[PDB]
Design a protein around this nucleic acid. Structure first.
Length: 206
DNA sequence: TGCGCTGAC
DNA sequence: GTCAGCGCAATG
């Protein structure tokens, strides 16, 4: 098993792989947290993240995307999601993603000096991101490859509350699964949606 | 809309 | 131990 702090691609899991549920993506090692959008360690960096349309400030343009940090929410009442209700902070997961940027951690945001030297982040796109993105898969989760953090900065989001934003750019030798070349690669690799054992059965009989 | 669960600390 | 949390096959 790859360690939890493994940076980079997971051996045996090619770009284009698909899983129906987040828990499955977690077991693959691609994105360990089954809920959180970012998997990171505040004093190391972020190993992966998921675009699932959970934050209104996310902007997905394929090879480039602006990701939103987590937090700035009031999850009281034993919740896991809510609208913005407070300013986000460059701590925990947000500090982790910032560390991937090839530049000294800056409390006011920073820009990378040769973004390609930054730490790699595995990116997964979820179907729920399809309401505001033409790159999200129609179903489940899809591993889209390695991206790097070009820069990050704070600014008020659509809600009026401060949010941390990150510009990610793809840096992977395998083709993007959404392009013509990528769909051919997926076909060539024979990749198909991974469902839990007995899921389809419980779906049909249902 | 709240629960069981997992990773970070 | 405590807390964060881009889930969800659930439930009204």
């Amino acid at each position: 098993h790859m360690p939890a702090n493994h940076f980079g691609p997971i051996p045996g899991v090619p770009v284009g792989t698909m899983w129906r549920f987040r828990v499955q993506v977690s077991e693959s090692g691609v994105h360990r947290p089954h809920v959180a959008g970012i998997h990171g360690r505040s004093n190391d960096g972020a190993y992966s993240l998921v675009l699932a349309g959970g934050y209104e400030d996310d902007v997905d343009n394929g090879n480039y995307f602006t990701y939103t940090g987590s937090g700035g929410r009031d999850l009281s009442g034993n919740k896991r999601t809510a609208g913005q209700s407070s300013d986000q902070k460059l701590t925990n997961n947000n500090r982790a993603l910032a560390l991937n940027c090839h530049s000294p951690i800056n409390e006011k945001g920073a820009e990378a000096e040769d973004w390609r030297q930054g730490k790699p982040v595995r990116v997964v796109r979820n179907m729920k991101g399809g309401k505001h993105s033409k790159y999200a898969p129609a179903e489940g989760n899809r591993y889209d490859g390695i991206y790097k953090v070009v820069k990050y900065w704070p600014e008020r989001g659509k809600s009026g509350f401060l949010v941390w934003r990150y510009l990610l750019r793809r840096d992977d030798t395998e083709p993007e699964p959404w392009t013509r070349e990528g769909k051919d690669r997926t076909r060539q690799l024979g990749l198909t949606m991974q469902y839990p054992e007995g899921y389809l059965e419980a779906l049909a009989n249902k």
